[PDB]
Design an enzyme around this catalytic site. Structure first.
Site, mmCIF file in Angstrom:
data_model
loop_
_atom_site.group_PDB
_atom_site.id
_atom_site.type_symbol
_atom_site.label_atom_id
_atom_site.label_comp_id
_atom_site.label_asym_id
_atom_site.label_seq_id
_atom_site.Cartn_x
_atom_site.Cartn_y
_atom_site.Cartn_z
ATOM 1 N N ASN A 68 15.975 57.461 69.596
ATOM 2 C CA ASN A 68 16.094 57.559 71.044
ATOM 3 C C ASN A 68 15.264 56.519 71.783
ATOM 4 O O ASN A 68 15.815 55.799 72.623
ATOM 5 C CB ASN A 68 15.713 58.964 71.503
ATOM 6 C CG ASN A 68 16.691 60.013 71.021
ATOM 7 O OD1 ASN A 68 17.817 59.697 70.640
ATOM 8 N ND2 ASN A 68 16.269 61.270 71.038
ATOM 9 N N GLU A 96 35.790 47.017 54.899
ATOM 10 C CA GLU A 96 35.172 45.707 54.705
ATOM 11 C C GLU A 96 33.673 45.751 54.980
ATOM 12 O O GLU A 96 33.051 44.739 55.294
ATOM 13 C CB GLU A 96 35.859 44.682 55.597
ATOM 14 C CG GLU A 96 37.225 44.238 55.107
ATOM 15 C CD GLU A 96 37.152 43.133 54.074
ATOM 16 O OE1 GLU A 96 38.009 42.227 54.116
ATOM 17 O OE2 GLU A 96 36.235 43.161 53.227
#
Ligand SMILES: Nc1nc2c(ncn2[C@@H]2O[C@H](COP(=O)(O)OP(=O)(O)OP(=O)(O)O)[C@@H](O)[C@H]2O)c(=O)[nH]1
Ligand SMILES: Nc1nc2c(ncn2[C@@H]2O[C@H](COP(=O)(O)OP(=O)(O)O)[C@@H](O)[C@H]2O)c(=O)[nH]1
Ligand SMILES: Nc1nc2c(ncn2[C@@H]2O[C@H](COP(=O)(O)OP(=O)(O)O)[C@@H](O)[C@H]2O)c(=O)[nH]1
Ligand SMILES: [Mg+2]
Lengths: 430, 32, 48, 439, 51, 49, 430
Positions: D206, D254
């Site tokens: 955060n 990928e």
């Protein structure tokens, strides 16, 4: 007669083909619906080299497009000239290989090859008298680097005497678009050396340098790259399609270029090239053409030709010119560069002439040169490959599909042997 | 539109489509 | 006339061979060219 | 014909799923009712929305998502909100009793009765797809129910589907700022569970994005909605290449073949750029060189870690807009030349690059503005070991006196379960420091 | 953009007269769409600025 | 040409059946949704009573 | 002259006839009311083959429709071209067989067949000169698979010298819709082999695959399947009704396709078949027709022909073509694939030519191939039969109305012996 079929695979292969057929159709005056609208009579005499006839007078390319994902073909069809391609000739996978040579050569491509090999057998068989095959592929992507080489293997095992030509895009470490390039590049070249009758290499970095330095254009694009490659490709086979003083087809170049069976890796070049602001300043003459052929920066490969010695050279001219000027310029250059030409081979330049120049051009040249200088890129890829392999980087993604490290060791050994043998002749003297 | 990126930007510039063989034609017949 | 003869005038006709592709060898795609073009129409949705 | 399926578990997961599903619907042009405008008249078409949506045959589009929770407040708010017409009425799975930050409750007591329905819904949704690319999973890790249900879901899916790729977008507890007091225990247990069961996991702590909002967006008073918008924009950047045409296309498959040196190392940290307010966005050109520099300065990192403290393994980058590969190459050259960024020795090359044409969209009333170029990068580097070390110290300080242990023991979990998690974390640290040494 | 001519400053700051009348150019000659022969180069004034 | 008229006529007759089944299906679909609608309003109107 | 009458039974056979007669009427230019409106009078020279002349100048099919359920007959009467049929030939029962071969062959079929046999014998004796009879039926259903075969045996018992042809639709395990299919299929084949002079096998699964693949259409129907089957049926006898270079009727085909009396189960196929989108891409030539007819996927049976070797092949061409290309293509394809052609019989392909092409196509081809590959369907049906038979499943339904397990054992033994003898000639060498 002596026509050739086209086989392309991978995203880069399909992109190359989309512009190669574009430029060839422009040369032969065929509209994107496939009906002849040309001017000259010669433009139709040798159409059957690349095109087949259909009812209603239309022409269809004899090309086969393969890829393991549908997006690339779905994109290339929608562009200009995309309707020429026969819809049945698309062969494809539903999952893709993900830059994995193991996946593209062992697991998925092995299952898929049935349909594509059937259709290529059909297309080759339908032709009158075969001349050979040409393939376009990139060595940086797994699916291309695997499927193309495996198809090469099987098609060679079926047609031992026909000629095979391969346009290989090899990854330079500067523009490294994939982190696993050395693995599949070495695996590809190991299989390619044993099977490819001819291979010509193309470097994206060299294309980029040429586009930035010679054309003086600000921001090049993959369209411009494909255009350069398309012009270079058309230059080689223009002789096969048009009459000339000395026609010299693929078998001619093959027999006349390679001194030894395992040295069939060439680098090529095209001329002339200039900006339109200097397009009228320049004078199109044979001395200018030879200056631009043998300039180092003109080559579209990262190898520096002045760091090695040419085994042989070949130049094909387009347009009308005298044989005397060509031969005298060739002799003059061969005498002025005695250091860079290996001495034990006398008169090691081939010349060819074609009377029909490219559209809009008065003279042009395609050059193919075989020199010992390309060992540098092999050494660089070998260094990067061993840097990866000593720590077993990325290895499990390949070893999980039945391939082991013994194949890796054999490939590295074979490529190292090729490099050593290839430099052996560099210092050989008579 | 992406026309600024699709196509090439190359300009390279009739009665140039006759074979070099077409220098072979016509030429009528001319003691003691 | 019943075999292979070579000359620039007269061509050689083809000799096809059966392929080894199975009946169900995958491959699909490109549903844009179909005969049916399954029906799509417009109805507004109620506000519940 | 390419699809992915998304799972949102935990309150943070639901609140970020709201933001992402707003953005995707806005980008693809579907109204909150689920029906595309009748004025636009698209006619016959496919793909695009097909990646995330499924067509009803005639009309509205069902997002390929499922929401899981045990506390019904957020699901009730969604079902009474403006999007009540979009989602399916029986795909918003909600329980009755909350786990109350108890990982044992959410892993052994009450999640077992919900996981069956969740798997049934997953099977039903997967039977619709034919070119399934993979699964996305979103879950706050510092919450008991989120951690437990995510762990159980991954554990079941690994054997139910096997080799299908899954991506985990986890929000680790921050170093010093925290909401509850019991995050360390459930965080460590969840990391132990997911280590051998997620293919790729990303860092979403955060304070990093909090400082990003403070510095760049010039927002002194931000709430969770802005952070969710940022994460949603990152998700769009990642998934754009699947559903939009680009010169260099990259699939989700990928990634595990280009970013993972060893099966153990799959935790990664991300950055995005630009983040500029509309009041000052148009004052600068936002060219590729400076944008890719901004992608790399440590201050703009989305994880509270210093990349200067360790070596890099691999960086995979997505560009969207009108960027050109020549400029991309030129920028990569300068980044390589720069002396403050170090790559590992056995990886002379470490860059993977993808290019896409569609510019990122804006949400009206949002914070970010129209920019024609954007880049989002994912990096795997050795510097991430610091967060594991600090949570290890946190967990040790607590397990020394066995505080709060009864709140997990009384719910059926074996006492020594924490021990093996501790040794696994130690082994992970050893693997990191082992791969960090040169040859 | 993206065509690549080495463009730039084509004629320098200098003052020269019209060849026909052998009088220097003034504001009256510079009307939009007129043809002005600067040295050897003839220009046609296509469009003007709002100012 | 004489081949082509016959081919065109064959194609026309074959296309006619596809067209016919098309309007049949689309009117059926319209009836389906028109019948769907007329119960939800009943539910709301019953709610008030 | 030398004509053939048509008999159909069962739902599938009636649906086949409903399209066969319609397509024949289209070819011969007959309106649904039976009044000639054709453009040529060549359409009337051999109208005696199928159509009888009635007072009032109208023409009628010589077809006998027989069934144990009136629903299908009532449904087919209301369709287009349903008014051609003589109302008298409609013969149907009141109960139905319930897919029970015993019920449809022993109890109700035997008592009903008197009337249909009377009408067929009347149709036969009224005619000038009988060629033979042809039947269309499916082997998966009780009523057809029983009563059709009993009619076959009866008709043979009074016409020992005429030619007898049947189109049997056999149930493939992929498209399976009746759980008692193997029992009635084996029982019907046992009787069919002993009486039918020619049988041609059609599989719904193969038709469905052809429709999905080569026609590239998503939602076919039984109408389209019947269309394909009817075109195939018409192409067999087209050369009988029309002149040509080499006419060759059904007796010619019977002589030239049967090596031994019991090997008379053929698989057929039609060419060309292309999608609408690629209709104008294709070029129609004899090589295209031959490569398409000999393709494995085009065959109307599920048997894979390259799993065995062809015994005999027959090709029926339609259109304006010369004997050169036809004969040389047959020779060349037989030479190139000698591995798939039995060796102890030289030149095992017959060709025939008819001058009148199908309405709408310039060239057409019907292929009929007797190959040893059909053993697979027999093996599968026998395997399923014995698997169901080991536990005596469903056997009480058949044993409750006259037959016993002895006949089932005899049928299985004969079926297996047929398989063994049929495979015996596959491995035989010269
Ligand atoms: N990034 C982000 N994190 C959040 C948000 N809301 C809560 N969190 C984090 O989630 C942690 C607690 O888990 P929650 O998601 O709030 O609740 P939960 O996962 O359902 O677990 P329970 O509270 O037991 O129900 C807190 O420490 C927060 O750091 C949010 O809106 N955005
Ligand atoms: N010249 C050229 N090269 C391309 C093009 N597209 C991709 N490439 C090159 O191909 C390499 C990646 O190949 P890839 O797309 O993975 O091939 P694939 O795996 O077979 O699909 C990159 O290094 C690019 O430089 C193109 O359109 N033109
Ligand atoms: N070609 C075609 N075959 C059909 C049709 N309807 C059913 N069949 C086939 O017929 C078989 C069932 O035969 P059935 O109707 O029981 O024959 P019956 O017992 O003589 O009536 C199924 O396997 C179907 O494949 C149709 O309309 N056309
Ligand atoms: Mg919570």
């Amino acid at each position: 007669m002596r026509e050739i079929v086209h086989i392309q695979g991978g995203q880069c292969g399909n992109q190359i083909g989309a512009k190669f057929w574009e430029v060839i159709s422009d040369e032969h005056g065929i509209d994107p619906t496939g009906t002849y609208h040309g001017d000259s009579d010669l433009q139709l005499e040798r159409i059957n080299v690349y095109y087949n006839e259909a009812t209603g007078g239309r022409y269809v390319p004899r090309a086969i497009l393969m890829d393991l994902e549908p997006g690339t073909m779905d994109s290339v069809r929608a562009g200009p000239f995309g309707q020429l391609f026969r819809p049945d000739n698309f062969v494809f996978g539903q999952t893709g290989a993900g830059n994995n040579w193991a996946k593209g050569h062992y697991t998925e491509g092995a299952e898929l090859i049935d349909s594509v090999l059937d259709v290529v057998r059909k297309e080759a068989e339908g032709c009158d008298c075969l001349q050979g095959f040409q393939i376009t592929h990139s060595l940086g992507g797994g699916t291309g680097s695997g499927m193309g080489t495996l198809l090469i293997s099987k098609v060679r095992e079926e047609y031992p005497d026909r000629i095979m030509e391969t346009f290989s895009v090899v990854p330079s470490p500067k523009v490294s678009d994939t982190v696993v390039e050395p693995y599949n590049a070495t695996l590809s070249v190991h299989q390619l050396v044993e099977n490819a009758d001819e291979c010509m290499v193309i470097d994206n970095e060299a294309l980029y340098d040429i586009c930035f330095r010679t054309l003086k254009l600000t921001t090049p694009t993959y369209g411009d790259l494909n255009h350069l490659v398309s012009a270079a490709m058309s230059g080689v086979t223009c002789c096969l399609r048009f009459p000339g003083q000395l026609n010299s087809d693929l078998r001619k170049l093959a027999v006349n270029l390679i001194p030894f069976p395992r040295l069939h890796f060439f680098m090529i070049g095209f001329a002339p090239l200039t900006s339109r602001g200097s397009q009228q300043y320049r004078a199109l003459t044979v001395p200018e053409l030879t200056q631009q052929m043998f300039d180092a920066k003109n080559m579209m490969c990262a190898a520096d030709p002045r760091h090695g010695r040419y085994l042989t050279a070949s130049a094909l001219f387009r347009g009308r010119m005298s044989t005397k000027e060509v031969d005298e310029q060739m002799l003059n250059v061969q005498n002025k560069n005695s250091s860079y030409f290996v001495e034990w081979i006398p008169n090691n330049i081939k010349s060819s002439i074609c009377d029909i120049p490219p559209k809009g051009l008065k003279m042009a040249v395609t050059f193919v040169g075989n020199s010992t200088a390309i060992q540098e890129m092999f050494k660089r890829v070998a260094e990067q490959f061993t840097a990866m392999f000593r720590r077993k980087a990325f290895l499990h993604w390949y070893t999980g599909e039945g391939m082991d490290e013994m194949e890796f060791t054999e490939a590295e050994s074979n490529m190292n042997d090729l490099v050593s043998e290839y430099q052996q002749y560099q210092d050989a003297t008579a | 539109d992406m026309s600024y990126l699709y196509r090439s930007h190359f300009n390279l510039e009739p009665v140039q489509h006759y074979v070099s063989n077409y220098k072979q034609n016509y030429e009528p017949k001319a003691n003691d | 006339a019943i075999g292979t003869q070579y000359d620039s005038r007269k061509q050689t006709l083809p000799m096809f061979s059966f392929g080894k592709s199975t009946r169900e060898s995958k491959r699909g795609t490109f549903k844009d060219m179909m005969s049916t073009q399954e029906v799509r129409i417009r109805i507004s949705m109620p506000k519940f | 014909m390419r699809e992915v399926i998304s799972i949102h578990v935990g309150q943070g997961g639901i609140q970020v799923g709201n933001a992402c599903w707003e953005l995707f619907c806005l980008e693809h042009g579907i109204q909150p009712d689920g029906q595309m405008p009748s004025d636009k008249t698209i006619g016959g078409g496919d793909d695009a929305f097909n990646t995330f949506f499924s067509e009803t045959g005639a009309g509205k589009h069902v997002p390929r998502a499922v929401f899981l929770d045990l506390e019904p407040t957020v699901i009730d708010e969604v079902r009474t909100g403006t999007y009540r017409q979009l989602f399916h009425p029986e795909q918003l799975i909600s329980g009755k009793e909350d786990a109350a930050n108890n990982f044992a409750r959410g892993h052994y007591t009450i999640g077992k009765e919900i996981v069956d329905l969740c798997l049934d819904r997953i099977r039903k949704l997967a039977d619709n797809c034919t070119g399934l690319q993979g699964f996305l999973v979103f879950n706050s890790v510092g919450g008991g129910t989120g951690s437990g249900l995510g762990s159980l879901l991954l554990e079941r899916l690994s054997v139910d589907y096997g080799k299908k790729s899954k991506l985990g977008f986890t929000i680790y507890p921050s170093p010093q700022v925290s909401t509850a007091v019991v995050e360390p225990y459930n965080s460590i247990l969840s990391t132990h569970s997911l280590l051998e069961h997620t293919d790729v996991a990303v860092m979403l702590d955060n304070e990093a994005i909090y400082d990003i909002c403070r510095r760049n967006l010039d927002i002194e008073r931000p709430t969770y909605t802005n952070l969710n918008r940022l994460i949603a924009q990152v998700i769009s950047s990642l998934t754009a290449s699947l559903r939009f045409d680009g010169a260099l296309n990259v699939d989700i498959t990928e990634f595990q073949t280009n970013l993972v040196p060893y099966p153990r190392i799959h935790f990664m940290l991300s950055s995005y750029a630009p983040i500029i307010s509309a009041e000052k966005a148009y004052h600068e050109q936002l060219s590729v060189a400076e944008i890719t520099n901004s992608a790399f300065e440590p201050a703009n990192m989305m994880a509270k870690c210093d990349p200067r403290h360790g070596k890099y393994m691999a960086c995979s980058m997505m560009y969207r807009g009108d960027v050109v590969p020549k400029d991309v190459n030129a920028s990569i050259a300068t980044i390589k030349t720069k002396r403050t960024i170090q790559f590992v020795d056995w990886c002379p090359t470490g860059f993977k690059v993808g290019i896409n044409y569609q510019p990122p969209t804006v949400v009206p009333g949002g914070d970010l503005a129209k920019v024609m170029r954007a880049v989002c990068m994912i990096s795997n580097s050795t510097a991430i070991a610091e967060v594991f070390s600090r949570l290890d110290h946190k967990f040790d300080l607590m397990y020394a006196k066995r505080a709060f242990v009864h709140w997990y023991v009384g719910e059926g979990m074996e006492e020594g379960e924490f021990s093996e998690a501790r040794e696994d974390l130690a082994a992970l640290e050893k693997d990191y420091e082992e791969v960090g040494i040169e040859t | 953009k993206n065509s690549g001519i080495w463009g730039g400053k084509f004629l320098e700051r200098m003052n020269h007269n019209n060849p026909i009348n052998n009088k220097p150019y003034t504001e009256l000659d510079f009307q939009i769409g007129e043809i002005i022969q600067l040295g050897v180069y003839r220009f046609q004034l296509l469009r003007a600025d709002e100012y | 040409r004489l081949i082509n008229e016959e081919a065109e006529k064959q194609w026309q007759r074959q296309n006619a059946i596809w067209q016919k089944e098309r309007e049949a299906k689309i009117k059926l679909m319209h009836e389906v949704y028109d019948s769907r609608k007329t119960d939800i309003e009943l539910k709301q109107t019953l709610v008030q009573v």
